[PDB]
Amino acid sequence: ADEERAETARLTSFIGAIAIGDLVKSTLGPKGMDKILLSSGRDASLMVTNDGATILKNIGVDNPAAKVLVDMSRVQDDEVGDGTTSVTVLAAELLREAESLIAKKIHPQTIIAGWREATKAAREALLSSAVDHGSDEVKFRQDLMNIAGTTLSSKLLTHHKDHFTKLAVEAVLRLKGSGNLEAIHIIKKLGGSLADSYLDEGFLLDKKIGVNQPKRIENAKILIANTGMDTDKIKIFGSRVRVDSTAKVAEIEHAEKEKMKEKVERILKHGINCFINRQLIYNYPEQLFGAAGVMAIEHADFAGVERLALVTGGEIASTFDHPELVKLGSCKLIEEVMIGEDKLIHFSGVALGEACTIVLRGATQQILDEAERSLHDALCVLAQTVKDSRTVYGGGCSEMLMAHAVTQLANRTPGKEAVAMESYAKALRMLPTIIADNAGYDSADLVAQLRAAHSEGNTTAGLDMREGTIGDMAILGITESFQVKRQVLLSAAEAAEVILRVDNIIKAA
Amino acid sequence: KSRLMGLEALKSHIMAAKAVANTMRTSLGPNGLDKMMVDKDGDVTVTNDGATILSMMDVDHQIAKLMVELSKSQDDEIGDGTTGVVVLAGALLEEAEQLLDRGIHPIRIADGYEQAARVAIEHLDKISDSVLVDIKDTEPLIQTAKTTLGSKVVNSCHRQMAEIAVNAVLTVADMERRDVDFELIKVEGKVGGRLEDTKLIKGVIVDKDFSHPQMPKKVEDAKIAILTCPFEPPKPKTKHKLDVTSVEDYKALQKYEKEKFEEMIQQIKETGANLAICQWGFDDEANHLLLQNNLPAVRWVGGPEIELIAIATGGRIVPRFSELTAEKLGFAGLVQEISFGTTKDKMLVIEQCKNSRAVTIFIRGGNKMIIEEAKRSLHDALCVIRNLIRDNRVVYGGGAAEISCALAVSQEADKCPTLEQYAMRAFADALEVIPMALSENSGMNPIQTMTEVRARQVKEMNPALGIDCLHKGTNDMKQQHVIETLIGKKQQISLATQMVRMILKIDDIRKPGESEE
Amino acid sequence: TDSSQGIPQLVSNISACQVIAEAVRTTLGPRGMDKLIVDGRGKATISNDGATILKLLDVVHPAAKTLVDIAKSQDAEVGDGTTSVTLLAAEFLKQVKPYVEEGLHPQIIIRAFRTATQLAVNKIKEIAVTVKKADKVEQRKLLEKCAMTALSSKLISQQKAFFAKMVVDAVMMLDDLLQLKMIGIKKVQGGALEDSQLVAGVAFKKTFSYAGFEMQPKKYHNPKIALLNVELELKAEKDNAEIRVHTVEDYQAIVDAEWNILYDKLEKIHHSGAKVVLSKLPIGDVATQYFADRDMFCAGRVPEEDLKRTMMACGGSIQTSVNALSADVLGRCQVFEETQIGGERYNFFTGCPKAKTCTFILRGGAEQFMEETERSLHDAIMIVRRAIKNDSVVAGGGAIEMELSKYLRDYSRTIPGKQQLLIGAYAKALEIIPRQLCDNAGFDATNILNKLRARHAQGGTWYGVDINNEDIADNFEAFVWEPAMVRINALTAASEAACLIVSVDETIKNPR
Amino acid sequence: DRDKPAQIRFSNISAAKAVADAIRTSLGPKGMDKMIQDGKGDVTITNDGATILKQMQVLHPAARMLVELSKAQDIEAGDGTTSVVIIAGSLLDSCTKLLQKGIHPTIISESFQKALEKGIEILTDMSRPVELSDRETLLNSATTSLNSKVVSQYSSLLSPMSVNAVMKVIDPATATSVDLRDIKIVKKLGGTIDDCELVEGLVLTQKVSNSGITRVEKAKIGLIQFCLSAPKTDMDNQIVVSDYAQMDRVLREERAYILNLVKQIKKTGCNVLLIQKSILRDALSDLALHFLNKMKIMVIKDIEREDIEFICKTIGTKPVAHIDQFTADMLGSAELAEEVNLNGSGKLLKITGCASPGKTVTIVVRGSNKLVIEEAERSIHDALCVIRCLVKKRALIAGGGAPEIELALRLTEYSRTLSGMESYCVRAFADAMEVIPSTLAENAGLNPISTVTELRNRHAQGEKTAGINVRKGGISNILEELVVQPLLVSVSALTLATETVRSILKID
DSSP states (O other), X not given: OEEEXXXXXXXXXXXXXXXXXXXXXXHOSTTOOOEEEEOOSSOOOEEEEOOHHHHHHHSOOOOHHXXXXXXXXXXXXXXXXXXXXXXXXXXXXXXXXXXXXHHHTOOHHHHHHHHHHHHHHHHHHHHHHEEEXXXXXXXXXXXXXXXXXXXXXXXXXXXXXXXXXXXXXXXXXHHOSSOOOSSEEEEEEESSOSSOOEEESSXXXXXXXXXXXXXXXXXXXXXXXXXXXXXXXXXOOSOOOOOOSTTHHHHHHHHHHHHHHHHHHHHHTTOOSEEEESSOOOHHHHHHHHHHTOEEXXXXXXXXXXXXXXHHTOOBOTTTOOSSOSXXXXXXXXXXXXXXXXXXXXXXXXXXXXXXXXXXXXXSHHHHHHHHHHHHHHHHHHHHHHHSOEEEOXXXXXXXXXXXXXXXXHHHOOSTTHHXXXXXXXXXXXXXXXXXXXXXXXXXXXXXXXXXXHHHOOSSOEEETTTTEEEOOSSOTTOEEHHHHHHHHHHHHHHHHHHHHOOEEEEOO | OOOOOTHHHHHHHHHHHHHHHHHHHTTOSTTOOOEEEEOSSOOEEEEOOHHHHHHHSOXXXXXXXXXXXXXXXXXXXXXXXXXXHHHHHXXXXXXXXXXXXXXXOHHHHHHHHHHHHHXXXXXXXXXXXXXXXXXXXXXXXXXXXXXXXXXXXXXXXXXXXXXXXXXXHHHHHTTTTTOOOSSSEEEEEOSSSOTTOBOOOSSEEEEOOOSOTTSOOOOOSSOOEEBSSOSSOOOOSSOOOOOOOSSHHHHHHHHHHHHHHHXXXXXXXXXXXXXXXXXXXXXXXXXXXXXXXSSOEEOOOOHHHHHHHHHHHOOOOBSOSSOOOGGGSOOOSEEEEEOOTTTXXXXXXEEOSSOOSOEEEEEOOSSHHHHHHHHHHHHHHHHHHHHHHHSOOOBOTTTHHHHHHHHHHHHHHHHSOSTTHHHHHHHHHHHTHHHHHHHHHSSSOHHHHHHHHHHHHHHOSSOSOOOOSSSOSSOOXXXXXXXXXXXXXXXXHHHHHHHHHHHHSOOOOXXXXXXXX | OEEXXXXXXXXXXXXXXXXXXXXXXXXXXXXSOOOOEEOTTSOXXXXXXXXXXXXXXXXXXXXXXXXXXXXXXXXXXXSSOHHHHHHHHHHHHHHHHHHHHHHOOSTTHHHHHHHHHHHHHHHHHHHSEEXXXXXXXXXXXXXXHHHHHHHHHSSOGGGHHHHHXXXXXXXXXXXXXXXXTTTOEEEESSXXXXXXXXXXXXXXXXXXXXXXXXXXXXXXXXXXXXXXXXXXXXXXXXSOOOOOOSSTHHHHHHHHHHHHXXXXXXXXHHHHTOXXXXXXXXXXXXXXXXXXXXXXXXXXXXXXXXXXXXXXXXOOOOOSOOSSOOSSSOEEOSEEEEEEETTEEEEEEEOOSXXXXXXXXXXXXXXXXXXXXXXXXXXXXXXXXXXXHOOEEEEOTTHHHHHHHHHHHHHTTTSOHHHHHHXXXXXXXXXXXXXXXXXXXXXXXXXXXXXXXXXXXXSOOOEEEETTTTEEEESTTTTOEEESHHHHHHHHHHHHHHHHHHHOOOEEEOOO | OOHHHHHHXXXXXXXXXXXXXXXXXXXXXXXXXXXXXXXXXXXXXXXXXXXXXXXXXXXXXXXXXXXXXXXXXXXXXSXXXXXHHHHXXXXXXXXXXXXXXXXXHHHHHHHHHXXXXXXXXHXXXXXXXXXXXXXXXXXXHHHHHHHXXXXXXXXXXXXXXXXXXXXXXXXXXXXXXXXXXXXXXXXXXXXXXXXXXXXXXXXESOOOOSSSOSEEEEXXXXXXXXXXXXXXXXXXXXXXXXXXXHHHHHHHHHHHHHHHHHHHHHHHOOSEEXXXXXXXXXXXXXXXXXXXXXXXXXXXXXXXXXXXXXXXXHSOOXXXXXXXXXXXXXXXOEEEEEEEOSSSSSOEEXXXXXXXXXXXXXEEEEESSHHHHHHHHHHHHHHHHHHHHHHHSOEEXXXXXXXXXXXXXXXXXXXXXXXXXXXXXXXXXXXXXXXXXXXXXXXXXXXXXXXXXXXXXXXXXXXXXXXXXXXTSSEEESTTTTOEEEHHHHHHXXXXXXXXXHHHXXXX
């Protein structure tokens, strides 16, 4: 309806991007200042966060260029985990520095083309700032610890943070020689204390059945199955619905009853002590299992039931296509214990001892949910740090070192590409200035000092925003991985260049 | 009432065209800057090409409405240069306005544009070759492949997508005349793999129906039994339950399904073929039984989907189960089942070496955004080689051809004078807008870069030496590797001129206030 | 209830006319200056003559409505010169408008419009040259040079002679009208633009490809044509429906029973005699199965107008039922040939028994070449057709109008008082039409008009302005040859239209 | 930039201060009652701080923290609901000053928790232990707190009864925490304050059953949360009517169903059943109820969702929401179940003696007129809340507003010795404290700034000296007239206040 010409498009685009960059610059890092989430279009209730990711989803935006920022933020959450807020801020910064170039006389392509060459130079610099760590078991422990503690604070939860950091690093530590998460279950569950938390060495289903059914098995034999009882997974032993009579309502209820029982028999014929079902277990087959000697767990999860099947050494039935013809799993012990004020089922003696479950114990629901997410972003990080066991010196130490790399390049160059190099270095450097405000210690002194170190060549002083001074980094509790950072640099740039390149914004609203 | 009369009406038109023109101008060449369309649901899309962007765009004026039609013809034959016709058409008017202010009528210039188009084409024909063969057009097609990929979905050559793209078009050309359409070739995309997972399909690809990932998957023969009749009892695209009123009739209904599996399996076998395409379906249990019995069905085939296979094979679909003979079925040169997606179920490829009238190149994609861009490159590729088959010529285009023609048309203004003089002057600068705005979007000054190439037009003619179109320090078009078809650039010249001829026609600037509703 | 009266009221009515006269100002050739007229129904509209669009306008004056009505009168008779009538009437009134202020309000005006109109018609008819079709020419070669007149204007190079001799052949054979309706010209994509084809009969532009379209026959030597304004497809007769289930055979039975009804429809007409089935409504995918297998030809998705030409020429007739109908609702040809030309499949029906359509088939293979050829061939067919009916031919170009304006200048001297003034306005008004030809050719219009009067005072020849060459010269010796009769009609209609408006100056309106 | 949060935050502070101003003149026993106009056009007369904020607040983000802040206060102490708002707004006055100066918000938020941690030290040294297993010590501390509360007229009689409930739920020396998750407030029509009593088991509301037995000893506590009839049709019953025949066909199903359920309950062994409403359970049959009572099982029908969750923890009679889950484990052990129709008209079920985890006491509070019953309900609440606060935190501190000056003065001096950029934050925070005893003195009637200057000087020299005294209106020792507050009641006011001020400063 409206055709926004290249300049006019630039301003809307810039202002879109920037409005978003303020919110996430404040949320940033462990001392970062909170956001207030406001539910729009429906009520006006509030929640307080410090997570940059949540700002975007909860509170949307109608600016076309700002929508690109939202798409980008999604990608960090899953694949990398942490860095959802860290990216969004740098991308807005890159555009800010872009503003002065479009004005001067300088076309958008000039700025793009020279930031691509600059991204390649920054990456080379990310490798240099990346020193290997956590090759040996002792160092490997120390290595997971630093990254994981970073993540939680930046996405909210900083009170009970340390207890969860011990369990999370131990969990990844067991795996050894693979970055699985396909055995490390994450269970968030009501009951327990906020201080206590538990890692069972095995696998743990938090689903229970009371003390009215068996729960004590020694030398357990596992059948993993998806068996309907009312859902009615195939291997029917009931009837079709037909209507021929006014008493026919009675006939249906009975026919379901023979169905439930004939399926109990087929399960029974495996020769097992522990039966797990993703689906419902009706009141009638439940009692028939408790009598047979077989444990009943109903309402198992789609993630956990499958994931259980691998570790224990079973195999799933897959919609009850295997009624006696699927191989078992085995565990040494099945004990019911009370951890918190809950009853849990504890699989122990699991075949692949890689498997662990991390059980989060809330006593405020607001904490328990936010904690699950922030800890999941952290475990995404952890498992990539298996593939390459190295860290970079975080804190603003890397950002300056990429900025500087690109400043020395910038100097060499006098062409069209050279222009944007000046812009690119400034953009990277503008991130510690944000970290400096978050500290609450004036930016100009710190960032200038930091700058000085890295020219001479040093990555053994960084910014401590936890002391408000320029300090050592020697793999402390405030470094960042290489894993998170490579992806964060790549995406910020990539997003900004797509925003630059779109200047033929036709809005038909 | 309100009335924009004569001159006033003409001024209005000029304002519409230059705004449309400029959006297109900053999208010229692979140094182009992308288009983002936001709709009325706020759904964001990234596209490129003149033709597509206009079509989505709600027309706000008269010249805007005219351009959409114009663009779509450029898109069908040529498949590139869609944005470049538009830039030229609006540009030429932006100069006509300047002529108007001097005191020349739009009438005088508009006749001399038609003449100035005629002289531009003439000059074009001298530029580059006009003789190739189809095992030697391939090196320009590789030059077309660099630019076309590397401004859309990727910023790089991908040799796999390009080479798949060019074969498909050749399969249809040798069946009739050395001519192909844009309805005999298609890019069908289905998400599951990555953009580099691709196939060359020589006929068509249909989803192959499998009830479960424990049922057998076989293929055999080289021939397709195209049916609408059953290959196992129907269930013809509507809900059904079971309407038995005894236990007895349920038990009865299962054995009757067993016999019909066998009997259809044999009837098809006997004629030849054993993979069936049936328009109708049947529930999940009956299908599972037939897959176990072996000799795979395809069940739940669209009403369009069957028409697609038939047109490509050239044969017919039986209306009945009675009437079956090998003649009455369509003819394939191979049927083989290929893994669609990279973690998804197998599909059925029906390649044909018998007859071809629909050759699909099967592209896989991840997201909805990345597939739509990737197919955008494909469409443009199908079209440039369509021009070659019919008559084999290429031109160096990107800036090279336009400027060389421009200098030529300029020179004749001063050989001729009279009526066409002003028209020639304006036409020669219009042609030069095309390399110019390409440098505007790109990293380097528009005036400076235009001046550079113009120097080498006096020093040498018929140049492989245009402006940068890989964003380089050097400027060529042999080392920037942009090639257009000679006919393709030729078709632009016609089209731009055209727009001017259409606005001239009547004198009905009278409006009741209805003129863009 | 409204009433308005006065000398300023008269002035109103004329002012309205100017507004419609501007809409149609120039359209004589292909130059002027247009604005696309898009309606509120969401349709984009242009035409090849500007009087068409003008008909659609609804004028809120009754006086302005008269000038609309005479447009409709001209268009129906000649089919040309419709524009011309608006211009003369309006312009006459324009130079009269300031004369009304001065004193030319009296009804005497009507009398003067009659003297000027009656003389002028007679002068055309006498000066015009009466030429046989067998004088010293073939009938086709007289009309060759007249058909060229439209063809030279736009914008078709040297193929113009060749096309001209071709376009004639269709018109002579049919002749009995002055309209192009029973001829037409059909564009075809692809093929040679260095020759075109004259087909006696009808043809179809495109029939869509269906499943076993090449498994259907393309040639017949006694095609018997079924004209169907119906369709059979999946949505015209169903092939999906609910059934009871208690056996597999129930499912088979329902699809089976439906396929029978659709098979009945082609069979019943095939047994009458049909083997060619022509339909303008769609034919589907299920539909085309039966045909492909029978080895009986089918066609769907052919234009509604084209199907109606097929009726006249082959002697077929419309149906609305295809079951159990005679064989006297069928037409025949002697030749059915299907040749795919360009991207589109082309059906040719020729060998037609009474041949009440013949039509030129123009092959170019573009959109650019073909619309300008079609535009010129539309007006070609108008000049040649009307040359059979009135065999008096005069110079066009507005050359003869410049002579009338001379002639009437003379007359104004012996004709008295208030009438003289009226005559001087008639004379000035005749020069407007050629002024626009000067605007189209690219000249200074006022400079030019004066040079043609000089050779209408130094010989009385045929000097006028050419758009058919874009120069100034004799138009008779340039073969710009069009009948006397277009000019006879346009004068008399322009006076008639005029007299009504200047007479009304008291308008009573009711918005009831 | 952070300019636009700067501008938003000041606007939020100003709105929060304005709402908080009304409550400074409602503070303490000498508080000024507030006539509050609802969006409903009704005047509400209150002197309790918390409900003023709740009943109507402005639509700004700091205003909302205030409702939340006092809501948190209620669960934690139950006391200092009024005072907790006072310190919050007073701190936000201090913050504007810091901001302008160029002390960043991050600094003021960590310094404000650091100053709480530093404040609690100074407080404790002043505090003085009392016994938590002795009845008399807890009563004196509770009695002093009651004179200060709004309600006091019948609180003399309710105070020894408030301790008695709490003493039974204290069994070790640690004295647990004592929540209201073990002390149950039940009301009964009719009776006096002297008739009120502490029932060992739980007292349950209503009592539906006149065909049942009326006294059964050695009873088994059974819990129903399953139906007594086949599911809804259109009524809670399966039975519905639209034809004579239609009712018959449903009755065939229902009849079978009601006998197997009533019988199943009896076979497991129960003599008390706890049944909910006919809008909280999808079916119940009058027919099934007549039989269920006539088997000689004591029934209460009709009770709340809140009640059912309460019982399940306290007397260990765990959920039974299905037939399958009546097993022995779920059942309680009651010593007696009894109907009482004395000491207030109407019939309630008393279970006296119950096998229980923890220990659960219930006080049936009672009174002659409807308004007498409500005054005593307020009175036990006030009385119990202070006891629970002291058993959590053994030491005892003074009231009267003197501790509040005494912390401040120390916190100023210490801050200067320590120094730092955060010095300004901890010094201004201490001065934030000086507002509340000053605001209190004005309500007692004496020129306020002059009162708080003088008490500072008495604290500086002597320490434990003068405080705001209700007799004098002014400056006289609170050592001669004991005004005590539990240590948790003051810890709560400060730590909650800081947290709220922390969120607002952090909020963009």
